[PDB]
Scaffold this motif. Sequence first.
Motif, mmCIF file in Angstrom:
data_model
loop_
_atom_site.group_PDB
_atom_site.id
_atom_site.type_symbol
_atom_site.label_atom_id
_atom_site.label_comp_id
_atom_site.label_asym_id
_atom_site.label_seq_id
_atom_site.Cartn_x
_atom_site.Cartn_y
_atom_site.Cartn_z
ATOM 1 N N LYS A 182 -69.381 -38.154 23.674
ATOM 2 C CA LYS A 182 -70.650 -38.126 23.238
ATOM 3 C C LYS A 182 -70.693 -37.108 22.100
ATOM 4 N N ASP A 183 -69.650 -37.057 21.166
ATOM 5 C CA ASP A 183 -69.578 -36.239 20.228
ATOM 6 C C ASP A 183 -70.330 -36.968 18.922
ATOM 7 N N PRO A 184 -70.839 -36.043 18.114
ATOM 8 C CA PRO A 184 -71.274 -36.668 16.704
ATOM 9 C C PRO A 184 -70.435 -36.973 15.964
ATOM 10 N N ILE A 185 -70.496 -38.354 15.327
ATOM 11 C CA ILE A 185 -69.579 -38.882 14.511
ATOM 12 C C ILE A 185 -70.241 -39.260 13.165
ATOM 13 N N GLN A 186 -69.561 -38.655 12.066
ATOM 14 C CA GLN A 186 -70.409 -39.066 10.829
ATOM 15 C C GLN A 186 -69.355 -39.825 9.732
ATOM 16 N N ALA A 187 -68.002 -40.000 10.096
ATOM 17 C CA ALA A 187 -67.162 -41.074 9.298
ATOM 18 C C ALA A 187 -65.838 -41.229 10.098
ATOM 19 N N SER A 188 -65.204 -42.274 9.750
ATOM 20 C CA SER A 188 -63.990 -42.708 10.500
ATOM 21 C C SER A 188 -63.021 -42.905 9.226
ATOM 22 N N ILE A 189 -61.719 -42.322 9.544
ATOM 23 C CA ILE A 189 -60.482 -42.483 8.617
ATOM 24 C C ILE A 189 -59.817 -43.857 8.823
ATOM 25 N N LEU A 190 -59.608 -44.875 8.135
ATOM 26 C CA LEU A 190 -59.009 -45.999 8.477
ATOM 27 C C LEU A 190 -57.536 -45.821 7.936
ATOM 28 N N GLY A 191 -57.142 -45.116 7.114
ATOM 29 C CA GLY A 191 -55.754 -45.150 6.568
ATOM 30 C C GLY A 191 -55.447 -43.881 5.741
ATOM 31 N N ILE A 192 -54.357 -43.522 5.602
ATOM 32 C CA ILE A 192 -53.939 -42.352 4.660
ATOM 33 C C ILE A 192 -52.249 -42.799 4.372
ATOM 34 N N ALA A 193 -52.077 -42.342 3.276
ATOM 35 C CA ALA A 193 -50.648 -42.622 2.682
ATOM 36 C C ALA A 193 -50.187 -41.594 1.635
ATOM 37 N N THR A 194 -49.005 -41.486 1.271
ATOM 38 C CA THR A 194 -48.548 -40.455 0.401
ATOM 39 C C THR A 194 -47.441 -41.143 -0.381
ATOM 40 N N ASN A 195 -46.997 -40.612 -1.641
ATOM 41 C CA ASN A 195 -45.750 -41.014 -2.267
ATOM 42 C C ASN A 195 -45.802 -40.301 -3.734
ATOM 43 N N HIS A 196 -44.594 -40.450 -4.398
ATOM 44 C CA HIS A 196 -44.458 -39.439 -5.408
ATOM 45 C C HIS A 196 -44.368 -40.475 -6.710
ATOM 46 N N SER A 197 -44.597 -39.722 -7.780
ATOM 47 C CA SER A 197 -44.468 -40.320 -9.277
ATOM 48 C C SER A 197 -43.294 -39.701 -9.969
ATOM 49 N N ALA A 198 -42.253 -40.392 -9.281
ATOM 50 C CA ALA A 198 -40.884 -39.794 -9.819
ATOM 51 C C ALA A 198 -40.304 -40.542 -11.014
ATOM 52 N N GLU A 199 -41.073 -41.545 -11.420
ATOM 53 C CA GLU A 199 -40.734 -42.229 -12.824
ATOM 54 C C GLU A 199 -41.414 -41.806 -14.078
ATOM 55 N N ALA A 200 -42.274 -40.761 -13.774
ATOM 56 C CA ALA A 200 -42.954 -40.184 -14.904
ATOM 57 C C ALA A 200 -42.104 -39.628 -15.900
ATOM 58 N N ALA A 201 -42.774 -39.635 -17.112
ATOM 59 C CA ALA A 201 -41.966 -39.096 -18.255
ATOM 60 C C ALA A 201 -41.542 -37.838 -18.212
ATOM 61 N N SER A 202 -42.634 -36.788 -17.444
ATOM 62 C CA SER A 202 -42.273 -35.451 -17.427
ATOM 63 C C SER A 202 -42.454 -35.161 -15.860
ATOM 64 N N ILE A 203 -42.109 -34.107 -15.527
ATOM 65 C CA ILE A 203 -42.199 -33.878 -14.105
ATOM 66 C C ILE A 203 -43.872 -33.770 -13.667
ATOM 67 N N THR A 204 -44.502 -32.908 -14.705
ATOM 68 C CA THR A 204 -45.982 -32.874 -14.509
ATOM 69 C C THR A 204 -46.879 -34.007 -14.753
ATOM 70 N N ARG A 205 -46.171 -34.631 -15.608
ATOM 71 C CA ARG A 205 -47.064 -35.915 -16.279
ATOM 72 C C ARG A 205 -47.340 -36.837 -15.242
ATOM 73 N N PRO A 206 -48.520 -37.593 -14.765
ATOM 74 C CA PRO A 206 -48.689 -38.542 -13.894
ATOM 75 C C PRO A 206 -48.127 -39.810 -14.142
ATOM 76 N N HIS A 207 -48.010 -40.709 -13.287
ATOM 77 C CA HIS A 207 -47.414 -42.096 -13.587
ATOM 78 C C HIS A 207 -48.375 -43.130 -12.951
ATOM 79 N N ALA A 208 -48.903 -43.940 -13.660
ATOM 80 C CA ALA A 208 -50.149 -44.894 -13.094
ATOM 81 C C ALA A 208 -49.549 -45.896 -12.122
ATOM 82 N N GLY A 209 -48.320 -46.327 -12.361
ATOM 83 C CA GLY A 209 -47.797 -47.418 -11.616
ATOM 84 C C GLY A 209 -47.420 -47.112 -10.205
ATOM 85 N N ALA A 210 -47.159 -45.816 -9.949
ATOM 86 C CA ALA A 210 -47.105 -45.038 -8.562
ATOM 87 C C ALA A 210 -48.456 -45.159 -7.938
#
Lengths: 49, 145, 96, 1282, 286
Positions: free
Chosen positions: D631-659
């Motif tokens: 009988k706890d109060p619920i206000q949302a449900s998490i369905l999934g979660i994942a993580t990865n790395h943008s190791a193909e970026a041009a630079s370490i700090t730069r993001p990678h859209a494909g990843a």
Amino acid sequence: ARNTHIARSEVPWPRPKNGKRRVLLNNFSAAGGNTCLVLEDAPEPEDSQ
Amino acid sequence: PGRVNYFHKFSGPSYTIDTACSSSLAALHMACNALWRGEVDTAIVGGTNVLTNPDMTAGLDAGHFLSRSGNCKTFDDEADGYCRGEAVVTLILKRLPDAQADKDPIQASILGIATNHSAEAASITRPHAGAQQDLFQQVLTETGL
Amino acid sequence: SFSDKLGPQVNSHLPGAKAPTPELTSKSIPSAIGAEQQPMAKSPIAILAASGRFPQSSSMDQFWDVLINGVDTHELVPPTRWNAATHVSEDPKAKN
Amino acid sequence: AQMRVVAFGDQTYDCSEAVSQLLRVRDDAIVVDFLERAPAVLKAELARLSSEQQEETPRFATLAELVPRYRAGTLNPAVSQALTCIAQLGLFIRQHSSGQEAYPTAHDSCITGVATGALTAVAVGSASSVTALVPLALHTVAVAVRLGARAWEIGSCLADARRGANGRYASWTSAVGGISPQDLQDRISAYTAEQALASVSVPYLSAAVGPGQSSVSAAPVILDAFLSTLLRPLTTTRLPITAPYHAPHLFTAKDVQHVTDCLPPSEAWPTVRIPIISFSRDEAVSRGASFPAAMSEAVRDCLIRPIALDRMAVSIANHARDLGKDSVLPSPIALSFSDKLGPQVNSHLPGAKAPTPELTSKSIPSAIGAEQQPMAKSPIAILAASGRFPQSSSMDQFWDVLINGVDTHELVPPTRWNAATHVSEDPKAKNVSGTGFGCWLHEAGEFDAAYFNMSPREAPQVDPAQRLALLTATEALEQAGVVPNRTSSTQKNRVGVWYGATSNDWMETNSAQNVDTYFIPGGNRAFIPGRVNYFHKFSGPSYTIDTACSSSLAALHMACNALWRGEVDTAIVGGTNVLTNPDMTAGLDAGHFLSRSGNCKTFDDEADGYCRGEAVVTLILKRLPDAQADKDPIQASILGIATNHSAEAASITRPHAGAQQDLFQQVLTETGLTANDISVCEMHGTGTQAGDSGETTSVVETLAPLNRSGSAVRTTPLYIGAVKSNVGHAESAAGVSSLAKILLMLKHSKIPPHVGIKTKLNHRLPDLAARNTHIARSEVPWPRPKNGKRRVLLNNFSAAGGNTCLVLEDAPEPEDSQEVDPREHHIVALSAKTPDSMVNNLTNMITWIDKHSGDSLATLPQLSYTTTARRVHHRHRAVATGTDLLQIRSSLQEQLDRRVSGERSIPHPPNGPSFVLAFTGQGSAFAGMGVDLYKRFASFRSDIARYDQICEGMSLPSIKAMFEDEKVFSTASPTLQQLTHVCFQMALYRLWKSLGVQAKAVVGHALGEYAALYAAGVLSQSDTLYLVGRRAQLMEKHLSQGTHAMLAVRAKEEAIVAAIDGPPGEAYEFSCRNGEQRNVLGGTVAQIQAAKAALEAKKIRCQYLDTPMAFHTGQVDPILPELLQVAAACSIQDPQIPVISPAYGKVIRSAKDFQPEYFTHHCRSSVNMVDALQSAVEEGLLDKNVIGLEIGPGPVVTQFVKEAVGTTMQTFASINKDKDTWQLMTQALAKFYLAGASVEWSRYHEDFPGAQKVLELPAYGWALKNYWLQYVNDWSLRKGDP
Amino acid sequence: AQMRVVAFGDQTYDCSEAVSQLLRVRDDAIVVDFLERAPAVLKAELARLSSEQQEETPRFATLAELVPRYRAGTLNPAVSQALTCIAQLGLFIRQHSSGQEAYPTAHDSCITGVATGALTAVAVGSASSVTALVPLALHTVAVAVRLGARAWEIGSCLADARRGANGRYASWTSAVGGISPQDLQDRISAYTAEQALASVSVPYLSAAVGPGQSSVSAAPVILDAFLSTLLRPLTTTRLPITAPYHAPHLFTAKDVQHVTDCLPPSEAWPTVRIPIISFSRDEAVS
């Protein structure tokens, strides 16, 4: 009395025949946490002859 | 771990764990958790410690954690604390079937790992024997030994 | 409980008969390759390799050389970390 | 009379939908295990292919990744055959495992299969249960992989993919309809004769679908060149077959043998039991063959024999006729044109039919606790959330800033570090930054040290991150109604803490200016969750995660992993970021990370960096079934979660859209949702041009794609937003900050405006309008669809290159109990650890009541439940009672006025109160005694039922009717009256004992001795029942009616003795000595009349007693031996508590005094209550500070106890003739609570489901104080100078 | 030519080894699913017990934690009943799923069970496969919990735990050897007549295991006092039964109705299809 020793000198630790050696690993925390781990021995290698 | 991922081009998860003096084993536990549900097939677990700030040593001494006499005298009657050490080490982990399928070398096998908190201790820093005993018994029961 | 006596008791009320069990009936077919392994959950995790840099040791072999010989590696702080002469006192009286 | 037929289809049937459905099954163990074990076998078999083939196979982790490739048509024949087989087998297994269907048997069923389905026919015809089928299924999967690989090899050797491959695999066959097979064969023969072709490469017909349909196969080029000569009115359709099959001129027995070499030889191979109809072979029906042999025959069918599909129905009908049945019920699996099967099967059979009602498809109800899906892959419920944001001390103020569209950035305040020295227009000096803007919390130094047992010396040197984590964690736990050890899922060993932190600026800058004993405990990041665990005594895992600028979602991922593995039941997740080290700002500006103009302006055309913000957020997580059952109060449900790395970026700090796109797609596919289900996407949006453009394009490509025609495919608008333009980049609590915003929008059902775009929308972004995507500039309504839910996508990226994604959902629709709380009076309890916190709590509660006075009539019971059951009760306590919210408000207001006027709260005694339990005689009984208790409390009902059954066992009258009818008290036999009295007393005592009222001593009066003896552990309930019943029965049997009588006088003993002629005892005797001024005389009726006449002549007010019998008189003489005999039977024990016994007039404390003669003495001797009371008061058992409870129909004995003890001994009753029982019970519980008793509030409400709901009450009124260590003298700009 | 009979035991048999072995199974999906769901149903049913009974129930995250308490004899009757039924059903399911054993069929099989094993008997007799049997297994677990709770309630009503219990649950029954059941019945009647006793606390014959052996149950102190009257060559051995059972003078149709009230009414409930041998009943086979 409990049959536990602190090795003051090098002692052999042979692998039992048709068996494995098991170890307990402890690493505690100044914050309070405790982590324990039970280690084993790799299976006898079945290298192609 | 970010530099490892970037240089080796590993596109999987990458975390740094700052649990405690037990950070390395906590990271190993997290890696095993990831391995046990198929998130990753290979893992690179490690732990680093390099001392270059005098203030950390000063604080640890002021907290009566360190020994003003030498190294750690484990099991000795005069033990009076530990002495800081430096070490870096990395390990490669896989599920046993995967390790055997690729014909990789195998040095040992992890059967089970568990964590808990000594929350009933007198003070936050001090240890609690009951919690550790419960942890050991839980791990032993889970491993089936 | 006391199950082993169930057979003789029950069969004692029936016409004479005795049939053994073929010990080979437990023979099983071989599992498909890749299926014999137990599920991923709670499966053994292998350690493939390990490397590190420890005191007085630039490899694991040197680490073992240190361990088996019973040598402790503690020493006063080098001059490349900080100067012990001024950062350490017999009784800490100054700041930090 | 009816035969079922199981039919499987060939590759013509698009199985992508079936595979997608099976991967979404979560309620079948067999199906899940099979789908985990099939990919492993598939991969193991693929690894042993040829070298060229292995290059063309995709790399996959699960079967999900092969679905889009299957749809695109870029999957090689081997994986295609494997997927067809897996889909068929999974469908059958799921149908016969969770569909609760009887496995086919050899008498009522047959199995058939088209070429690729002939393997599955053998797989399921050689077993007798799904469990025995699973291994054969894996063998069949491997065989299918090998078969596809062999066909692919032969085909590839026959022809090479054309230059314009595009990746798609050409089709090797085409269905042609318009001529009979013979004419098509004649045409093919003429074509291959006129045109010279290699005998191994000619076209051939690989099927016979019907009287005017067929199929033709050849190499794509040759087939295209041949189909061109088939002009109208013949129509051709290209089937999706990517390799040659059914070619007796390309395959031999050797190829068949090679394919079926994966099956080792043995004798344990099961045979074929269910007949299999092989319409293509010579013998239509086959059975009794081993498993490898039947598999080899099936492979031969699929490689060497053409499909004779114009004979399936005839063969099935012939089998049905042979078995004697008259109708066929088809159950095709992955069969094309399956709808037409049954008609043409029954056409050849004599007419018959047997419909099955759909109402018969119903299922047995699952046992409670077994309906929920396994904890692995289960929704995670967010129960509460608390945080501290800039210009916000809670989440409501955060909503204020969000909806009002306010900008928060400002220059560094003097508390952190001077801007005139640490900031320059163009950095030239050492350790000097060009930017000094951020979003700060100006109350980060405020903490309640006393509440958390910290000291004023230790508090300043604790990282503000830890202090705010403690505050927010306590607030969130209180808001979710979680009290440790209250429930299985809230046990202290099942709670863990995860926190995401990426800085310890306190140690670097403030704490290090003087190193003290609390440097390491107060500075290390290890203690952010450690302090929470220690203070709240949770004994589960505790971690700190330093992943990146995306640490909070990493911590959430780890917590969800721990919950999904079952190693915890509740998780506390959060993220902290307080900025106090100028060096971090200098180093972020030296790396061109921070904007030198202002806040984060995301999607703007002039984005040039982000702004540093601060925020602390804590959430409470739990698996959905555990939250619902709690009988706890619920206000949302998490369905999934994942993580990865943008190791193909041009630079370490730069993001990678494909990843990022791969991460989003992976999470979406795993969660089982489509792009159209996500209505809102909260993105990282860190206010940098390239990063913003890349993130936006990836998000739009994932959630708002474009069809080939170039038009939008979304049917509903998608809204994009970023919380960082309002509060900045918390940079370690950013993920939890975004999640908190999402929770607030879900609560208020509206999307706040976007303030980032200050000049013009960035021109490098995709054209959002064409995609049906919007950036809200003004708040838009976000209503929940009826009978539906709204979902979100959350992003969090890193400078180190890590990306994290998360999919949210709406909580299930509340199922609130519509039962009305029958209780009239209610109790509201407040508590605090300090008098100041007590005043704050009272004020906040009064304010809340005023704002909620007229919301509804069910609010008062729920407020009582929340304040009492779902709360931790501290030393300082205050309570209020009433029938409506107005009465409670008035009482609380009066208490607050008195407290503020100058009074001071005092903590209750550490050990709580002490109780003495009084049991009355048989004088106060009335009709309807304890009838409402029997109706409202289930424990009382069960106790009374058990007592009644036991009485019936011992040949005594029933007692239940005296608690239900309510009109039988008038005509109750004396034995029945005594039995009811004792049973009611015992059940009532057991009730109070259930609410945390522990007896330190029990004192009865002439009939409570039996109940008191039970309550002291001397006797059992059965023994008490037996004693009382037999005593009453003997009294009624041996004696008569009216033999004696009793009378009471309100005068001293000496006065009554003097006023009566004759020595005491010989004529009249004392029966009960209630008190100094109260006595009861008993004797013969004539003697009683004479005594009354004598005393009334002295003008003394006496009264006759309604008691028909007479206890402790001479009338009880002729039954003493029988009572002695009866009492010798019962067991006896040493009392657990002192038993004040009026019969013996002392404090009995051992079993040596309760010998059988004791019962006879009590039944005969007088009730010397006063002497026993004085003995107890002398012994020190009873004091004025001891509370007295009354287990009985009214406050009779407790009055005597009060006279004996003193005048300031507060006492309470439990039942009354005129007052409502609930008024008295509520008053007693309130006074016990104020005393310090640990009442079992959970059991007080368990019988009234209508009151069991957790409200959102005001947070704890902390007594905040400032604890800061100021950074002084600008020493950070001289790091290295002498 | 031959028929197999599957027989289920009772509380007397020790099940610690069986439960421990079941928790170490990893190659069976059905058994793992059952061992995961059963604790959930046990926890759901243990929340419906009375207040005094819940204070004496241990808190367990999984079945692994109940084995140490079961071995130490510190488990109340409800959880012990649940554990016995769980062990029986798990052993059967593992044998017939991983063991690749054909399910019992009415043609050449018959189920049978003693007092606690009759619930498992009916659960196994109403199904045709392990998959179809798993839900009925959870229903049986709930019913076993309720039955143990009712027996414990009545037993606690009769007499309360002794002062020096130290946690252990005193045994309520004990086997007797050297007498025919009839002469033992007359001995019980004589002992009852000589010492007047409440009709509920009197000793009674719980079982008749053989021509010269039987079982007697009563409150621990009453039972201890009575057994002292039996002198050599009369032999007595204790049994690990911690509540009153098989007592027609303590339980009525109302108790039976209450115990089986966790099964919602419906007309799907599969009917037993393989005969169950009921030796205690008047009809041998049902």
